[PDB]
Each structure stands twice: as C-alpha cells, then as structure tokens.
Amino acid sequence: NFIVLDKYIKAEPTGDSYQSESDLERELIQDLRNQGYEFISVKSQSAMLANVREQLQNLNGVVFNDSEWRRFTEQYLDNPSDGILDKTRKIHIDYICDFIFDDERLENIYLIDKKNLMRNKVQIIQQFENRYDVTILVNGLPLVQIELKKRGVAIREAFNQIHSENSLFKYLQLFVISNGTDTRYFANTTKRDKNSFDFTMNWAKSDNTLIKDLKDFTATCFQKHTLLNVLVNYSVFDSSQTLLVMRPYQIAATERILWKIKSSFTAKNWSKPESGGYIWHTTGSGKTLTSFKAARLATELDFIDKVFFVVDRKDLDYQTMKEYQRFSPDSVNGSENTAGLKRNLDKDDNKIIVTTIQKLNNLMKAESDLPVYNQQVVFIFDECHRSQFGEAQKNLKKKFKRYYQFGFTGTPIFPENALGSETTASVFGRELHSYV
Amino acid sequence: NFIVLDKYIKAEPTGDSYQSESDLERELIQDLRNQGYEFISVKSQSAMLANVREQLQNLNGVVFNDSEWRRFTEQYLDNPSDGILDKTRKIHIDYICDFIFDDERLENIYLIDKKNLMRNKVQIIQQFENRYDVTILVNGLPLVQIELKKRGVAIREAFNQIHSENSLFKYLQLFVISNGTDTRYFANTTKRDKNSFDFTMNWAKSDNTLIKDLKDFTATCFQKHTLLNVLVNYSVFDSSQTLLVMRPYQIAATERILWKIKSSFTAKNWSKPESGGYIWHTTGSGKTLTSFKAARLATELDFIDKVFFVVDRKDLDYQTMKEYQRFSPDSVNGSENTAGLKRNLDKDDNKIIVTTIQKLNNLMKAESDLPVYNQQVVFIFDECHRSQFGEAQKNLKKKFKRYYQFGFTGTPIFPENALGSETTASVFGRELHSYV
C-alpha cells in the first residue's frame, strides 16, 4: 500500500563494528539482495554502457543494432556537451527519446517507466577506479549513490569533506550520506553552511519516528516501489533550476489523501462528511509544494475531472499562482472573474484550477445549473474545516455532490482553541496526517 | 625501384585444380603471407571497426579513448548518410580529419599516409556472413576486394553475374576479378555491356607481356609499394564523378620519366641531349591523363620549380586545359598572352602551367633575361623530337639550361617515315617507353 510506513519494523544491530568502511558495505549489499536486487561486476566505464543497451531492451521491447546504438548513445543519452542540470531535466522532464530506427519507424524509447513503474529494473554496483561508493543503478543508469563514512567523520563534516571521466555518473539524483549510526539524504545542492545537515533529511515513519541506522533504513526506504516513488513521483525539478525533494511527512499526507480518494471512488462515495479529511501542517513546510503534488497527482489519477485548489483572496491568487508557475509548466488561473472561469471549466488537460472562494460563490449563487456538475471534482481548501464551516460550504452542500472536499489548516480550531468556529465533526470528518 | 616490372618472374602452376573455389583462396593467402601480410579473424562487423582504432594508432601515433572514438566513428569515418561516392572522395581527396581531442588540441588524423607510404599497414581477411571474397584491408579500411570464380564462369559473365549492413564495405576501390586462369581488375563502374571485360584491365609487364594467372599476378602486383602506389598515386577521382585507373603502360612510362628526372637531378645533369627522352603512345590512350599524372607527380617531387606542359595551338590550349579542369582542382592557364604569363611564372603552389610554344617564343625572343631562369624546369611537349627539331628548341638551347625536356609523339618520325623532319639523335636522346 503506502510509502511512508505505519508499523515500526524490527531494527537490530548486527555488528560488524562501524569503525570500518567495508563491513557495512557488505551488510548493505546483503540487505539489498535480500530485497531482491541484482549485483553485477563492472570494473570499467564502457561495459556499464553495455549494461544499458540490455536492461533498456526489457523496458522498451525493441532491438537495437550497434549502428542505432551509436546514434542513441552520442545524440541523446551520453552527450559530452551536457552537465548535471540538463541531465537531471532528462531524468524528470524529457525522459523519452523519439528515436528513428534504421528500419525507419519512429518509436518512443523510455528511460524510466512512470505509469507502471514495476517494470523499471534496478541493479546494484559499487565503486571502481576518492572515497567508497555504493550505487543503486536503475535501468542501466546510476541514480542513487550511497556514500558511507565512519563515526570519526561526523554528520556535519560528512557532507563538508568532499563537496568526465566518468560522464555516466552525472545521472545521480541523490547522495544518501551515512556512517553506521546516522543516515541522511538530499539532492544536487552543494553549499557549505546552508546545504549542511539542516537541508538534508531524516527519513522517518508516519507520525514522528525518525530513522538513524542503516538496517532499518534499508528495510523501510530501499524497497522497489518506495525508492522508485521517491525518485519519480515525489521530486520536483523546479525551474530555478533546482531539484526539490519532499519531506517524509509531506509524502505521507499526500499518500493518505490519494488513498482516501482511491478508496472512496471504488465504493461509490461522494458528498459525505466522512468522505473528506484534513491535514494540519502549520508552517515551515512549503504548503504550496505539498498542495501542488497532491493536486498534480490527483489530476493524472483518471478518476476525476476537475481539481479546485481554492483559497480566500488576500493577495493569494497572485501569490500561490506565482508559486505554481515556479513549478514551471501548467496551472490554470481562476483569474480574473466569473466569466472566463467558465471557459476554464470548459478547457481540460491542465486540470488544476486555482480560484478564490468568492468567485466560486459568485458562480454558484447564479448561472443556472452549470454543466460541469456531474464530473468528479476534488476541492483542496485552505482555512479548512479546522478553520471554518462557512456559508460557501453549505452552498456547496446544496449544489454539488460528486466532490472530494479536502483542506489544510495552519492553526486548527480545536476544542482547545474553539473561540472562532466549530470543530470538524460534520464537515471533513477525520484528521488524516499532521506534523508538529 | 619501379612498379611495372622489367624482368619476367617465374610463373608455375601449383595445382590445386581450378575447378574449386577454396584451393585458390588458400594458395592466394599463402602467397600474400609469403609477401609479408597479416591474416586476422573477424567473423563479425563491429570487431572490424575495433581493428581500425588499433591499426590507425601506429599510423598517427596518438591515443583515442572510447569517447573520442564515438565522435570520430559517427561524424567522420562511418557516416550512415553517405554512400560510395563521397567515401571514395574521402579516400582520395579528404583523407585527413582535423580532429579535436577531449584534451582540446587539434590534430590531423590521417587515413592513408601518402608521403611515406611504407607506414601504411596492410592486412588480409576473407568473407563472412553471396559468393566468395578475399579482402586486402589497408590500415583498418577494406580497400581491395579479390573476387574469385571458376572456369565455367567465363571472364565476360564473371562481371555480368553479380553487378548496410555492412557499411564498411563501401570503401572498396577495386574488384580484382579472377577465376584461376585469367585475372582482371577495375574500379567502381558497374554497367553491363560497356563495363564488361573491355573496360577492365590486363595487368602486364613493361612492354607487352600480359599476365593472366594468379601466382604471377600475386608475385608482380600485390607487393606493398606496388599495390599501394596503384591505389594512391595512380588513380584520379574525376569530378564526373568517376574513379579512373591508369593503364599499366601509362604507369610504366610515367615511372621511366620520373626516374629519369630522379637520376638526372642527383648527378647534376641539365641541358643535355641525353637528359631528355620521349614516349610514343599513339592513340586510344588519354594522353591528357598520362601527361597530367606525369606533370602532377613532377610538381610535388620537390626537385623542380616549374612544369611547362606546352603544345602548339590549334584549339589545344582550350581543349587540354578543359581536360585538366576536368581533373578538377588545379592547373594554371598560359592563357592568354605574354603579359600575365609572367604573373603565372611569379605565382606558385599550382606549378603546372599549360601554355603554347608561340607565347613562349614571344617571351623568349625578348623581355631581357627573365628571373625564372635558374629554377629547375621540366618541359613536357607534344609533337616531340620524334616530330620536330624546331627553331623554338634552338632558342631554348640558347637561353635555358636547367631544363628536363621531355615530349610525346603520336606518330614518330622514324627513319622509316623520315619525310618530315629528322630523327631523335641530338634532341631527346633515347626512347623511354612505348605502346603499339
């Protein structure tokens, strides 16, 4: 089911005292091969590229000769004129090459299969030819680089010590830094003070249970679906350009939201006060980012037709829209009126719509039985049922039925701070995932 | 010394009855390895390209990695978008790639070393994956394709029977067709009636001794310097486009001319009536082509400074010039006057000058001790000492001294036809090479 775990797995030390740099390598290879991986031997650079033209065969089902592989190698996969940024863009944005065969038919060669990601074959290798390196290599390309240390190299100086040929090691998205007792991970940002252990991430369980050691970290995160979802569906290549990786509580809340959608659609549920739910992530979050990944994975999920991330305007429809235009390509304005918002409800393929609740009430109190009624519609609020039970919501319970009404709160109106509005007892029902 | 032989070598049958297609293959491989060749085994297509990045190393003295070899393989040597014509042009015209290293220095990668051609390493391979094929493969590239037959396949139908992958076999310049008794050779022209055995060539000795069998043909022509000179210095890629290969008597006459130059320069000879010489090739020759190769190999020979291929104009300075512009790049007009011809004697790097004898007499009877006197100058006449002993020639014996005065005749004035002028007794001295 989920990605961020709910059950605390068994974590035991298997020493192998962690003042070494090879025993934890062997233990890590043992645990990954227990998790059904494949260890091959490439003490070279070209044979690694020979692995790609065989592992990609199973993923695409078509046969290269050597002559097509010349073109595919030098024009698309292994351009010498490219660094880390465009190659990361090739990982996350342009991951398909529209390749022309010598038989002259255009076929789409993938790199990472993103729809049905079980086909994406993983392998494990280690260092060859600096320090000691283990590499989880996905579909021929090296993606995750586990870098190991000792206790004398503390976690702050672990990053601070060290930050063609080879050019193939510019596909590395992550750098899982660990020593034997603490384990942190991050993406390609290499500053000294700011990109220290504060910007890196403690992987954790659902609520607050942080993970430090290796064996528990390997048992949790390095599953196939888990680590491939962390690589693919939960990382944003911002057009700064900067790769941004979600926090684990963000991923957990997004998974609870999307599984609530998935479990509610299969049991024909809509317009129920228990069909909703709400999240409390207060601040220091990038709630823009969590809401964006929730809405973006909702849009492709094919059960629905419209997603309304909708707030109350006090310079928010200019602000958060500017956030979602930062995550460059696509989000449709609810700007500027209730004439053209209907045009946005006519349009598709860019299904995330960011409007204000006031334009929605101006649409819903009039305009005579809109034709976007029967479609499956997901609301993502801000100032949710833990902040309001507003007149717009009872207008909504009057008009709409096939809606999944979710929301976010910054400070929830609990019974402990019930001075403003009610609690959540008949609007969103249960709380889903929180952070404090 | 020479290329076309003067001594009849021993030709003996070593049967191995020639109703087979494998015994003459074995005999041919035995004879070529007796002539100091190398037989490797490539039952593939890619490993043949692996031979190139090792044999070219000795020829250029520099080291590729795999990444430079990607660029050199796909951009220059093995373009998929090229056929036979541009690849033949790469053999004979653009045989150097100005390659940029990954260390960023421009160095000139050769294909065939043309100045000191002993470095050009040859190998021999046979067929793999049609009929039976033996291939002499020069410096990694396959150049000569010996194709073998039997007696039941007659020499006329031998060509007439059969006229990516592989693309490497488009470097083939020749097709030495033989059966076991007769042996013929030609270049890339594949018509039925016209490009039959008439346009192909009987290799021969100096005067008239034709060669038919294999063992004598292998003992004569498949020497390293002999076959590499036939490939390199005695083939013209005409801008028709058509590759033209010289006749053996043409090559023999050119070699006698150039060795007479080489033996006369080393013994400080000039202005002697025995320092000259003359050729009788009557017609059906392309005397334009023989004279062009004589003058062109004279110009690069570095002993001389000026070459005057000079005739008497009856629409010849427009005709033969049009022939030498057909052999596209470079030949300087003696057109149109004795004012600008002096400009042509000032200019260099295009040392072949085609003027008329009348403009020369207009230059030599006046203009007061020209400054192009002391340079080493080779005259190539037409209507030679076997056709005239003209007043221009005694003006020349008055003025010039450092000249090598050669000439051609169509019908020689022998003593047998001495009605017109004298013989050659004090002008060019000895006859050099003839054909009838």
Q: Residue B95 burial (CB < 10 Å; 0-12/13-18/19+)?
A: middle
Q: Distance (Å, rounded) from C-alpha B179 to C-alpha B152?
A: 9
Of A175, A145, A164, A176, which Cα lies nearest the Cα of A45?
Answer: A164
Of A17, A20, A37, A21, which Cα lies nearest the Cα of A29?
Answer: A37
Instruction: Name every chain B residue with its beta carbon within 8 A of the beta carbon of A73.
Output: 70
DSSP character string of B191-244: -SSTTSTTTSB--B-SSS-B--SSHHHHHHTTSHHHHHHHHTTTEEEETTTEEE
In three-state secondary structure terms, B374 is coil
Is B81 an interface residue toward A (CB < 8 Å)?
no
The single residue listed with the structure tokens 């039941």 is B152
- What is the H or E stretch that residue B262 is in? helix B248-265
Polymer length in residues for chain A: 436
Q: Distance (Å, rounded) from C-alpha A81 to C-alpha A77?
A: 11
Q: Which residues contact B47 (CB under 8 A, 6 or more apart)?
A: none
Closest by Cβ to B66, choosing from A46, A65, A67: A46
- What is the H or E stretch that residue B349 is in? none
Q: Distance (Å, rounded) from C-alpha A337 to C-alpha A167?
A: 51
DSSP 8-state secondary structure symbol assigned to residue B101: P
Please say whether the beta carbons of A75 and A69 come within 8 A.
no
Tell me the C-alpha to C-alpha distance, in Å, between residue B89 and each of B165, B170, B253: 21, 12, 27
Closest by Cβ to B67, choosing from A66, A71, A80: A80
DSSP 8-state secondary structure symbol assigned to residue B267: T
B255, B261, B262, B264: CA torsion to nearest 10: 140
Long-range contacts of B368-373 (CB under 8 A, 24+ apart): B370/B342, B370/B345, B372/B305, B372/B306, B372/B345, B373/B399, B373/B400, B373/B402
How many CB atoms are located within 10 Å of the residue A142 CB?
A: 20
Residue of B nearest to A103 (CA): B164
Encode A412-432: b = buried (16+ Cβ within 10 Å), e = exposed: bbeeeeeeeeeebeebbbebb
Q: Distance (Å, rounded) from C-alpha A405 to C-alpha A426?
A: 12
Residues forming a β-bridge with B107: B99
Q: Are strands A133-138 and A122-126 parallel, antiparallel or unpaired?
A: antiparallel
Q: Distance (Å, rounded) from C-alpha A176 to C-alpha A378?
A: 36
Residues forming a β-bridge with A280: A409, A434
Q: Distance (Å, rounded) from C-alpha A144 to C-alpha B212?
A: 69
Of B104, B195, B203, B128, which Cα lies nearest the Cα of B156?
Answer: B195
Q: Which residues contact A91 (CB under 8 A, 6 or more apart)?
A: A111, A112, A141, A143, A171, A173, A237
Instruction: Name every chain B residue with its beta carbon within 8 A of the beta carbon of A64.
Output: none
Rg (CA), chain B: 24
Q: For residue B119, how many C-alpha atoms fall within 13 Å in the half-sphere facing its CB?
A: 14
Please say whether the beta carbons of B297 and B254 come within 8 A.
yes
Task: Respond yes or no on whether the N-terminal peptide bond of residue A319 is cis (omega within 30° of 0).
Answer: no
- What is the H or E stretch that residue B163 is in? none
Structure tokens at B26: 């074995």
Q: Distance (Å, rounded) from C-alpha B276 to C-alpha B280?
A: 14
Is B53 an interface residue toward A (CB < 8 Å)?
no
DSSP 8-state secondary structure symbol assigned to residue B103: T
Please say whether the beta carbons of B164 and B174 come within 8 A.
no
Please say whether the beta carbons of B186 and B245 come within 8 A.
yes
The single residue listed with the structure tokens 């030390």 is A13
Tell me the C-alpha to C-alpha distance, in Å, between residue A152 and each of A19, A27, A195, A199, B214: 8, 20, 20, 22, 79
What experiment produced this structure? Answer: cryo-EM
Q: Which residues contact B327 (CB under 8 A, 6 or more apart)?
A: B236, B238, B239, B289, B292
Q: Distance (Å, rounded) from C-alpha A161 to C-alpha A13?
A: 27
Binding site for ATP, residues of A? 281-288
Rg (CA), chain A: 24
Q: Distance (Å, rounded) from C-alpha A168 to C-alpha B81?
A: 28
Of A284, A257, A270, which Cα lies nearest the Cα of A381?
Answer: A257
Torsion sign, CA atoms B213, B215, B216, B219: positive
**Three-state SS across chain A?**
CCCCCCCCCCCCCCCCCCCCCCHHHHHHHHHHHHCCCCECCCCCCHHHHHHHHHHHHHHHCCCCCHHHHHHHHHHHHCCCCCCCHHHHHHHHCCCEEEEECCCCCEEEEECCCCCCCCCCCEEEEECCCCCCEEEEEECCEEEEEEEECCCCCCHHHHHHHCCCCCCHHHCCCEEEEECCCCEEECECCCCCCCCCCCCCECCECCCCCECCCCHHHHHHCCCHHHHHHHHCCCEEEECCCEEEECCHHHHHHHHHHHHHHHHHHCCCCCCCCCCCEEEEECCCCCHHHHHHHHHHHHHCCCCCCEEEEEECCCCCCCHHHHHHHHCCCCCEECCCCCCCHHHHHHCCCCCEEEEEHHHHHHHHCCCCCCCCCCCCEEEEECCCCCCCCCHHHHHHHHHCCCEEEEEEECCCCCCCCCCCCCCCCCCCCCEEEEEC
- The two counts, helices (H) then strands (E), for chain B are 13, 16
Amino acid identity of A48?
A: M
Q: Distance (Å, rounded) from C-alpha B124 to C-alpha A328?
A: 60
Stated in angstroms to one decimal place, the resolution of this structure is 4.0
Structure tokens at A61: 């089902």
Closest by Cβ to A74, choosing from B46, B70, B102: B70
In three-state secondary structure terms, B393 is helix
Q: Which residues contact A386 (CB under 8 A, 6 or more apart)?
A: A278, A280, A407, A409, A412, A413, A414, A423, A424, A428
The single residue listed with the structure tokens 């990605």 is A3
Structure tokens at B286: 């392309």
Q: For residue A179, how many C-alpha atoms fall within 13 Å in the half-sphere facing its CB?
A: 14
Residues forming a β-bridge with B187: B174
Between the two ends of chain A, the Cα-to-Cα distance in Å is: 25
Is A74 an interface residue toward B (CB < 8 Å)?
yes
Tell me the C-alpha to C-alpha distance, in Å, between residue A128 and each of A51, A139, A180: 16, 19, 22
Please say whether the beta carbons of B186 and B174 come within 8 A.
yes
**Three-state SS across A5-59?**
CCCCCCCCCCCCCCCCCCHHHHHHHHHHHHCCCCECCCCCCHHHHHHHHHHHHHH
Structure tokens at A44: 């070279």
Please say whether the beta carbons of A370 and A342 come within 8 A.
yes
Report the residue of B44, B73, B74 to disrupt the A interface, i.e. the one with the largest count of A CBs within 10 Å: B74
Tell me the C-alpha to C-alpha distance, in Å, between residue B257 and each of B221, B294, B383: 20, 8, 17
What is the distance of C-alpha B370 from the center of its chain?
34
**Three-state SS across B30-95?**
HHHHHCCCCECCCCCCHHHHHHHHHHHHHHHCCCCCHHHHHHHHHHHHCCCCCCCHHHHHHHHCCC
What is the distance of C-alpha A180 from the center of its chain?
27
Q: Distance (Å, rounded) from C-alpha A389 to C-alpha A317?
A: 21
DSSP 8-state secondary structure symbol assigned to residue B185: B
Instruction: Name every chain A residue with its beta carbon within 8 A of the beta carbon of B80.
Output: 67, 102
Structure tokens at A226: 């888990």
Q: Using alpha carbons only, what angle is made at residue B323 by residues B276 and B327, rounded to the nearest 5 degrees?
A: 95
Structure tokens at B271: 């202005």
Q: Distance (Å, rounded) from C-alpha A147 to C-alpha A176?
A: 6
Q: Distance (Å, rounded) from C-alpha A361 to C-alpha A357?
A: 6
Polymer length in residues for chain B: 436
